[PDB]
Amino acid sequence: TVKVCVCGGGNGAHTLSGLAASRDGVEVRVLTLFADEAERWTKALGADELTVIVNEKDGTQTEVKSRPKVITKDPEIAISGADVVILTVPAFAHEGYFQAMAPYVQDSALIVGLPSQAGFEFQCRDILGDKAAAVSMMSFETLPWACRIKEFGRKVEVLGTKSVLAASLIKGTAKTVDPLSTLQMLHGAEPVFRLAKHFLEMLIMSYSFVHPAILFGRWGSWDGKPVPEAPLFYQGIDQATADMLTACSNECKDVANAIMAACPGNDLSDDKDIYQWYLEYYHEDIQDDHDLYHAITTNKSYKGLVHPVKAVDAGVAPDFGNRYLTEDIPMGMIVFKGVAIAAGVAIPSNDKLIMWAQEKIGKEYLVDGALTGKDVATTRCPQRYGFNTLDAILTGKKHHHHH
Ligand SMILES: NC(=O)C1=CN([C@@H]2O[C@H](COP(=O)(O)OP(=O)(O)OC[C@H]3O[C@@H](n4cnc5c(N)ncnc54)[C@H](O)[C@@H]3O)[C@@H](O)[C@H]2O)C=CC1
Ligand SMILES: N=C(N)NCCCCN
């Protein structure tokens, strides 16, 4: 039997619990530490099975029905004996699960971030301590599905499910169940999971700048004047924002190259241009792909997608807060900035974006190019956990003298 603990009670948690529990020889324990979400889910589901509606490419809908073994807020029941522990929650909830699982997680456990967001492994290492080197840490780029709960506890819809998805892996000393094939089995035929060469590649390939860039490209020098209605998001970018995304992406390559040169045996060559990335994973949706601007603006899976806005005098105004900034900055850009400092690589365009973004949401992470902001302890930059060197970042071991 493979024993999976699904952490969370969101769209993803519902879907993953639904899908994973439908597989033969799989036992699912749902863990959720959000107050009494666990009891609520339980009362709601009753004696029925959890239902997942999957929208196929045919336009048809397949119904998956299954039941988890237990739905609980008790980590001892959820984590003990678990072969795989999958965290599917907004990144701010990760700290709580790592803290809860710590004294119950076995050496052999595969600890999965679905999705991880940036700094997932640094946090995991810090919280689990000496147990971190034993377990394996798996980081997935994004969520496998586009999904929404329809009826809490008992029904979730997959609007679409990704064709391919990448994940990185830090192997522990303990032999886990096979990370890639086990995860694949839980998800079914799709996405077709591939293994990223190195976890830092996966972290950098998050392109945490993307959403901060887009918001800046449309609201950067915003004269305060309202607009009639929510402007297009991705499809609404101009040439300047495209260039900005190219600049940031290059800064990603810069950091990647610096690590490789300072640290032999760390293959980060799969860090590619955002433009080169778009064509790899959206080609069938892009009608005009001669450059990055056109690659993004003619992307058919970006149509109808608009900025978050709110009602103001004489029209509509950008709605910051959201998760483009409250997540992508502390759980994204800052982490990348932490690696950039450790590599010694300047990244003026990422910096430009951080400084602007944090002000919008009334947070402070970066000050004078240095990670000394008011709320820097709420981020996952490796420096926050005392991982200050590339070696510390890579291996999780601090230094270490010795009189
Ligand atoms: N289609 C989708 O739902 C997409 C979501 N994602 C990403 O995947 C991640 C998971 O997505 P969802 O499952 O939709 O997230 P969600 O927003 O549905 O998750 C809500 C869950 O977060 C936890 N939570 C909320 N407030 C909390 C609190 N203050 N303290 C402790 N726990 C709390 C609870 O368990 C709650 O059930 C997100 O980071 C999202 O950005 C990525 C692609 C698509
Ligand atoms: N890391 C990637 N390759 N893609 C990120 C998916 C977008 C999540 N906002």
Numbering used by the authors: 2 to 404
What does the paper say about this structure?
Octopine dehydrogenase (OcDH, N2-(D-1-carboxyethyl)-L-arginine:NAD+-oxidoreductase, EC 1.5.1.11) catalyzes the reductive condensation of L-arginine and pyruvate in the presence of NADH to yield D-octopine [(R)-N2-(1-carboxyethyl)-L-arginine], NAD+, and water. The enzyme consists of two domains, an NADH binding domain and a so-called octopine-binding domain. Furthermore, a catalytic dyad comprising a His–Asp proton relay system and an additional Arg-sensor (Arg324) were identified.
The evaluation of the data clearly demonstrates that agmatine acts as a competitive inhibitor with a Ki of 40±2 mM. Since no sequence assignment could be established in the NMR experiments, we solved the structure of the OcDH/NADH-Agmatine complex by X-ray crystallography. A 2.8 Å dataset was collected and initial phases were obtained by a rigid body refinement with the OcDH/NADH-pyruvate structure as template. However, the binding of agmatine induces a similar rotational movement of domain II towards domain I, which is almost identical to the domain closure observed in the OcDH/NADH-L-arginine structure. Also the structure of the OcDH/NADH-agmatine complex indicates that the binding of the L-arginine side chain triggers the domain closure of OcDH and not the carboxyl moiety of the amino acids, a prerequisite for catalyzing octopine synthesis by OcDH.
